[PDB]
Design a protein around this ligand. Structure first.
Ligand SMILES: Nc1ncnc2c1ncn2[C@@H]1O[C@H](COP(=O)(O)OP(=O)(O)O)[C@@H](O)[C@H]1O
Ligand SMILES: Nc1ncnc2c1ncn2[C@@H]1O[C@H](COP(=O)(O)OP(=O)(O)O)[C@@H](O)[C@H]1O
Ligand SMILES: [Mg+2]
Ligand SMILES: [Mg+2]
Ligand SMILES: [Zn+2]
Ligand SMILES: [Zn+2]
Ligand SMILES: [Zn+2]
Ligand SMILES: [Zn+2]
Ligand SMILES: [Zn+2]
Ligand SMILES: [Zn+2]
Lengths: 590, 396, 186, 590
RNA sequence: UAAUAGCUUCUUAGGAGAAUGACGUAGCAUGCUACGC
RNA sequence: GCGUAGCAUGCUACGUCAUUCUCCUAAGAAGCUA
């Protein structure tokens, strides 16, 4: 098979076989990749190995072709010649191949292992045809990384809403939420096959799982749970289609009596309809979930494809569009496997309807008039290229706040990925600025909202309320035990229970923590309804309690701090460890 | 596994002496590939054997016709030549005889194939060749039977069928004779043991099969090309009924082919110095070549003139573009120069003179399209009769 | 040839030989330079012919590689074509009738020749003359394969539409037989 | 195919790829053309690209004929030989190709873009084969200029009688008049197929076009239009069939007392009979287009085909023939679309009738006994070649005058074209002289002819009428509105409207102005029959109102103004702009 | 739309072999000459 | 008589080139036959 070189797009028929993705490489580019790095295996229309009865040489700098094969020096004929010479590696289209140096970064893209921080930061500022390749090889690396994993089963039948967990000894265990799903294996005597996928979550105390189910087929101990995995297909569409402006709005025809509800965004609705792709960053709780409904009511007859990275955001958007938009011309596209407790309220799963809501992973190849991508902070470059490949539409609108939490990004372990390089769209939003940005905030008290607009934001936020005089911030040591994979702060709950008796308000509070172990133990001794810092960001509460366990760069991440303190509305007790975290904000002392 | 297969019916666009349409069977590649892989070793072994009964792969040039005719006359006692016809040969052939031919061809697989392997190969042959789905004008019909003329083993299975019918005719001729009238005591015992081996014996008697094969080779020498056959039989035995005649072939084709073989398409030659009347559409004549007399095949002069006058493409009409077309036709029409009829002998000279005229006007047109003649021109040898005389001389 | 320094050795030996011949060098030096030029030219031609073989086998290898590949990009095309043909033929199937007749089968296996005859929704009757037409499908409805069919169209051999009033005993000479009648299962 | 070189008529098999018309060229002529110009692509029976696995070399001096195909410098089989060398380019009939220098005018003809004026004066004074090649490439360039146009779309439809227009952003907009047609698209998903043949014209108010269609399809907003192309056929027949002078009339027969009205032109009829083709040149309204009908009455048995480049001229000829010839044996041949409304009083579209009238473009291939081409000024060499190819004939008669207005020549924008280069026929008329010549004025009054014998004709015409004093020359400034890319003069139209209710005998005067935009938009404000100057030629009216829209080089053209005024029959009012032009004529006061 | 198989003619390319001729180098055999013993 | 050097003649081995022939394969055009 022939194709296009990755870094010069000339015709070629080589491939770097040692790479995870096996990218096409033109002659001069292939020589520059093999003489520099440690990849010495090149695949042409036939692999470049030693075709002897007995010999196995893979290196291409040490292969000489002869007759109709390739041998090393011990097995070559009286005739020559080097496969890799004159600056080129012998392949198809030998004289249409233009070299391109930008191999000095293609080496660092192809040879890195993504463990350090800088690999992402230089896998995102490179050119487009390398923006795609870096994303592809990153996904391949993650998929192969999920092939080295721990394995459990269910101890015994324990509850109808909860199972238990019997893991193997000597291997790590994953995080537990709707993102990480798990598979049962039925190797019983007798023919390992699948019965259904269960997602797992930590139990009350000791060892337990409170889960989410896929299939009703109830196993005995005869099944054991693995992670589950899949192939990564190659991506072709660019991350962002080129920005072309339009004079007057095209293919979008404004409405009659939109509403008196969101008529202050009419300028922003038309600025959405003007360009090819628009970018709207709205501070937490400023109406972007409501702006999508307003945009759909400003161009009433345009089919709109709403999309998002995860089921939570798209389901909240679905509920809002049921509450505001017309209901019968709605279509939520569900996965066939149904890995989640999906949303069945609409007339579900008809891809030839008008308001089509879907997740990025489950988008079917179709067309639209304007597609609204939501939560671009969550989305990786793979999701952006996927949504540009599967969906062609007259307009694209990316909405989301980079100040919220990023994607999981599991491989990253050393250093902090700053927001700017979350993906291409967040880089756009920080380089030149979001095209639209709505700054008020309808949840938080006065001091916190002014100071959060003064924390990181360029001072654009305000509150239409008065401060509830029930937000606090303490500095109690909260001695650490941490004798588990995450850090815990129990005697901090001791100090908070030394309060909370003179404060009868938050007696239905939701507990949050920067650590899942302390969150898990906080739901044990007192039945506080818990919702971790990640599981927030999309809901509002009026009673929430948040404690700090440690002091580190994971304790001062102002994205996490901003996503934390903005889920309460009238009352929050909170524990600050570092004097940095008691002084960027104004609250009472106690 | 059995793979059924669709065979197309293709109309044939070729020159012929009768106005009935001719159709060939285009068999699928999925059948041709496996049938080649199954039969091609034996088929190439038949085509590479000289001096056998089945003359396939034997050229008629360089003395190949004379060698064939000398092997047919293989020491028969009172030789008469005989040739018959199979009316509707490919469409009236019974399925039992086609299965017989396929099983005879598959006897070579006694070590490479198991019993079930050979059965499923026969079943694939029947499902793809014998009784298949036929595509005829965008419509699928069912072929009732008979051989299709497009399978890998078509000429060779046809040769097996031809030999089978000839052996059956000889068996019927020998058994339907009286027996009290047979003077030769050896042939009377041969008839007795032939009846024993037919209807009183269930195990093969290889000794008598060899004896009857020797009898047939001695008195009923054959030459088979897939439906053409020349026989050099003993005339005294055939008059006494000990060897098959034309009437025995007529009877056998009546009760075993469901056709009537009229004796107007079957010839008998009492004089061997004239050779077969017609074999592979070629007549035969005895000529003095060099110092010795040889048998040369000449075609119908009407056939060669029709091939010259009528073509199947508009660009075969230019002549100067196709001088090899007429060189080949003159190669085929050379033996007409030895014919006693002068109008037959003039066809070869006509072709040679047209080759010379074609080269003259080709060089004229080439010199017009340029201003220089071709440097190397070896076309002068194609209007000299020695290039064609050497085509029928046994040195190669 | 000219890239390799064998040509350089031959050229410098020839230049030295010519210069010394023009300078009137002695016979011994002349023979020495002649021998050196001869061995230099010997090395030159010996490393050359090899270049002819190099380019010949390189072009043969490149042509073989092109043939092995073009043939790999022509294989995917026919694979996709066969897949699309098979799936369109799947979508053509009369699924309910076929399901009924295949569930009635004891082994799940049925003769192929009854698959249209019991499940095909459309029948094409090709009729060579008028007597056959009167016998088999005269009228707007007729019976075949123990089913009832209604005539939806009639065309002639020219693929021109023919009306049922035009198929008569006296209008038979004016019709381009055979007539292909298309009927739908009632 | 095997063909003939354009400039030497030797045998050849080469063509120039870069040339629009791809003309055959012999070896010597092809080498001379390619080694000197920028054209470097030569098509033999196989094109001369390099046959590597992948290589793109077209320059012919780079290539070689190696092995069995054309290969470049470093792809060639080791056995050569050069293609473009030895003073030739290797092709068929190599050693019989002899040409001539005219490879200095052919370079200019092939290279020139037909923008300047000198390209036409070199495309009409060259040799006879180049006169055909230049006309062919000029038509080809005029066709390929339409490829640079902007394709439309529909905004919406409030009124179904007046389409709304929307041009593509970033391309020029074609003018809106009758000459240009359009054909649509519906490219949504869903039928990239034509939707009919439409045509446009502007509306006075707002933005609107009062369209017209060949069918009655509506445009759902995605449907749109593109101006249609036209491949140009080889200029197969010579521009003028070579002349032979017969001793006596052959193929034609005289008549018995032809009439008492045509008794003067008898000698010219006999001269027409004697020669193969004849040319009749006369000042306008002297008896030219009536001479042809008199010729028909003089050769009654002769089948005659009348033709012209315009429609409104052949319609006038049709009316005259109806007035004189027997109406039973006439016809009128109209194109399939019939953009203009043609003459429907004869048995329309029957080619095999005795007297057949048609435009040049819609001529059907037939024979005749004499073909009468009319108004040769309107005709270019393409029209002459077309009429000489389709219509075989025994005698040809070309009637027309050079001093009338020529063909449009939209590409010409620098300099002026003299009469003697309008086409081959006008060149013949001005060089050696017409074969028949008749001059005087029988139509226009004394005043207008006594002024036009000062503008264009150097005091040659006496005439016959009395100056009725109904010839008016107006002074009016006429402010400019360059609206439709053709000017509109609203205040001049206002002058006319305010003084067309003061003229009770002028209620039916035809409105003439050089610009089609004002001439078309005048229909609402005064309601008179309207006519542009270019199509008014050849037709007379009892009263004319002429309005010099704007001062330019188009409306101050003496030829145009002279062909404008002399269509009056008893009186004409004209409002003028150029202080000179109003002064060179002698009319009444106002 | 264009089957299976056989034979033949012609053209082009590649390899291998043979024969003859030519050049160059190396090895061996012989004749003549120069120097030393 | 031996050793070294040079010239001439002859034989063998190897390398290069020119011509002719045979064969083996591949590709293409065509003809006939069943
Ligand atoms: N025009 C408006 N006037 C008052 N409140 C509004 C208006 N538009 C939106 N809101 C409120 O702002 C809040 C925005 O939260 P949400 O709808 O989740 O979107 P986001 O999370 O993007 O801000 C909503 O609770 C909604 O009630
Ligand atoms: N012999 C004649 N006697 C009287 N009037 C004539 C004669 N010939 C022509 N006319 C008048 O002169 C006019 C000339 O018209 P035409 O030949 O069409 O002019 P042009 O050819 O310049 O358009 C005709 O309208 C006709 O009425
Ligand atoms: Mg939102
Ligand atoms: Mg006129
Ligand atoms: Zn690599
Ligand atoms: Zn490259
Ligand atoms: Zn090896
Ligand atoms: Zn050119
Ligand atoms: Zn020329
Ligand atoms: Zn090239």
């Amino acid at each position: 098979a022939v194709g296009a070189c990755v870094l010069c797009n000339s015709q070629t028929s080589l491939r770097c076989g040692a790479c995870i993705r096996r990218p096409f490489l033109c002659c001069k580019c292939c020589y520059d990749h093999v003489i520099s790095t440690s990849h010495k295996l090149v695949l042409s229309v036939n692999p470049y190995v030693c075709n002897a009865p007995g010999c196995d040489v893979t290196d291409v700098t040490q292969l000489y072709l002869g007759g109709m094969s390739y041998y090393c020096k011990s097995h070559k004929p009286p005739i020559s010649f080097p496969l890799c010479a004159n600056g080129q590696v012998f392949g198809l289209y030998k004289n249409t191949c233009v070299g391109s140096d930008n191999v000095t970064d293609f080496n660092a893209i192809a040879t890195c292992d993504w463990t350090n921080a800088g690999d992402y930061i230089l896998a995102n500022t490179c050119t487009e045809r390398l923006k795609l390749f870096a994303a592809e090889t990153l996904k391949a690396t993650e998929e192969t990384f999920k092939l080295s994993y721990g394995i459990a089963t269910v101890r015994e039948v324990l509850s109808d809403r909860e199972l238990h967990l019997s893991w193997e000894v000597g291997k790590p265990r994953p995080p537990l939420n709707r993102n990480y799903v798990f598979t049962g294996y039925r190797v019983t005597k007798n023919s390992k096959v699948q019965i259904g996928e269960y997602t797992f979550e930590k139990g009350d105390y000791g060892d337990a799982v409170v889960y989410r189910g896929t299939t009703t087929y109830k196993l005995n101990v005869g099944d054991y749970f693995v992670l589950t995995s899949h192939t990564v297909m190659p991506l072709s569409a660019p991350t962002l289609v080129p920005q072309e402006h339009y004079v007057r709005i095209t293919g979008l025809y404004p409405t009659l009596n939109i509403s008196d509800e969101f008529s202050s965004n009419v300028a922003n609705y038309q600025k959405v309809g003007m360009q090819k792709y628009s970018t709207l960053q709205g501070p937490p709780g400023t109406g972007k979930s409501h702006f999508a409904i307003g945009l759909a009511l400003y161009y009433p007859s345009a089919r709109i494809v709403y999309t998002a990275c995860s089921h939570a955001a798209v389901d909240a958007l679905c509920e809002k569009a049921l509450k505001y938009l017309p209901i019968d011309k709605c279509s939520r596209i569900i996965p066939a496997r149904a890995r989640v407790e999906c949303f069945d309220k609409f007339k579900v799963n008809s891809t030839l309807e008008q308001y089509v809501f879907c997740t990025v992973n489950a988008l079917p190849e179709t067309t639209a008039d304007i597609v609204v991508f939501d939560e671009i902070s969550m989305a990786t470059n793979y999701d952006l290229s996927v949504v540009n490949a599967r969906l062609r539409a007259k307009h694209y609108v990316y909405i989301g706040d980079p100040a919220q939490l990023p994607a999981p990004r599991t491989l990253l372990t050393k250093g902090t990925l700053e927001p700017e390089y979350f993906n291409s769209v967040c880089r756009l939003m920080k380089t030149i600025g979001p095209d639209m940005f709505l700054g008020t905030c309808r949840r938080c008290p006065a001091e916190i909202v002014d100071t959060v607009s003064a924390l990181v934001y360029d001072n654009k936020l305000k509150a239409h309320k008065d401060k509830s005089a029930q937000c606090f911030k303490m500095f109690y040591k909260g001695v650490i035990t941490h004798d588990v994979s995450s850090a815990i702060n129990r005697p901090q709950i001791g100090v908070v229970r030394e309060f909370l008796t003179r404060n009868p308000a938050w007696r239905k509070a939701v507990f949050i923590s920067p650590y899942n172990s302390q969150n898990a133990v906080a739901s044990k001794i007192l039945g506080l309804p818990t919702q971790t810092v990640d599981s927030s960001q999309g809901s509002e509460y009026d009673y929430v309690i948040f404690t700090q366990t440690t002091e580190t760069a994971h304790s001062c991440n102002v994205n996490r701090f901003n996503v934390a303190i903005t889920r309460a509305k009238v009352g929050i007790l909170c524990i600050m460890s570092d004097r940095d975290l008691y002084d960027k904000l104004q609250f009472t002392s106690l | 596994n059995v793979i059924p297969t669709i065979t197309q019916m293709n109309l044939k666009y070729a020159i012929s002496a009768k106005n009935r349409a001719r159709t060939v069977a285009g068999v699928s590649i999925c059948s041709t590939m496996t049938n080649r892989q199954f039969h091609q070793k034996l088929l190439k072994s038949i085509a590479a054997t000289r001096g056998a009964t089945v003359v396939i792969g034997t050229s008629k040039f360089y003395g190949g016709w004379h060698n064939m005719l000398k092997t047919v006359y293989s020491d028969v006692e009172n030789p008469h030549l005989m040739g018959w016809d199979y009316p509707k040969c490919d469409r009236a052939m019974p399925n039992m005889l086609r299965i017989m031919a396929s099983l005879v061809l598959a006897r070579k697989h006694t070590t490479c194939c198991s019993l079930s392997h050979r059965f499923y190969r026969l079943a694939n042959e029947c499902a793809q060749v014998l009784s298949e789905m036929v595509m005829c004008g965008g419509s699928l019909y069912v072929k009732p039977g008979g051989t299709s003329s497009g399978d890998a083993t078509t000429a060779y299975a046809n040769s097996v069928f031809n030999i089978c019918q000839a052996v059956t005719a000889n068996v019927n001729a020998l058994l339907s004779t009286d027996g009290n009238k047979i003077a030769d005591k050896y042939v009377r015992n041969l008839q007795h043991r032939l009846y024993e081996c037919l209807y009183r014996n269930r195990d093969v008697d290889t000794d008598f099969v060899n004896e009857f094969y020797a009898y047939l080779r001695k008195h009923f020498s054959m030459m088979i090309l897939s439906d053409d056959a020349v026989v050099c039989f003993n005339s005294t035995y055939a008059s006494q009924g000990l060897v098959a005649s034309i009437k025995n072939f007529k009877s056998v084709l009546y009760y075993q082919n469901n056709v009537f073989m009229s004796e107007a398409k079957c010839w008998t030659e009492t004089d061997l110095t004239k050779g077969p009347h017609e074999f592979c559409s070629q007549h035969t004549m005895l000529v003095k070549q060099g110092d010795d007399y040889v048998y040369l095949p000449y075609p119908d002069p009407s056939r060669i003139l029709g091939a010259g006058c009528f073509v199947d493409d508009i660009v075969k009409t230019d002549g100067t573009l196709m001088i090899e077309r007429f060189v080949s036709l003159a190669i085929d029409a050379y033996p007409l120069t030895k014919h006693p009829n002068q109008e037959y002998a003039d066809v070869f000279h006509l072709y040679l003179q047209y080759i010379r005229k074609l080269h003259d006007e080709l060089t004229g047109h080439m010199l017009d399209m340029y201003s220089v003649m071709l440097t190397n021109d070896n076309t002068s040898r194609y209007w000299e009769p020695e290039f064609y005389e050497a085509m029928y001389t046994p040195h190669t | 040839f000219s890239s390799l320094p064998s040509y350089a050795a031959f050229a410098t030996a020839q230049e030295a030989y010519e210069q010394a011949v023009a300078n009137g060098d002695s016979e011994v030096v002349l023979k020495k330079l002649k021998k050196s030029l001869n061995v230099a030219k010997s090395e030159f031609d010996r490393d050359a012919a090899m270049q002819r073989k190099l380019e010949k086998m390189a072009d043969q290898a490149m042509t073989q590689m092109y043939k092995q590949a073009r043939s790999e990009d022509k294989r995917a095309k026919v694979t996709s074509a066969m897949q699309t043909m098979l799936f369109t033929m799947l979508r053509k199937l009369d699924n309910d009738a076929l399901n009924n007749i295949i569930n009635n089968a004891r082994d799940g296996c049925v003769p192929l020749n009854i698959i249209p005859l019991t499940t095909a929704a459309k029948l094409m009757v090709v009729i060579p003359d008028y007597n056959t037409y009167k016998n088999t499908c005269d009228g707007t409805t007729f019976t075949y394969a123990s089913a009832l069919w209604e005539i939806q169209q009639v065309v002639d051999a020219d693929s021109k539409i023919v009306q049922l009033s035009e198929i008569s005993m006296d209008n038979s000479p004016n019709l381009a037989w055979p007539l292909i009648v298309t009927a739908l299962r009632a």
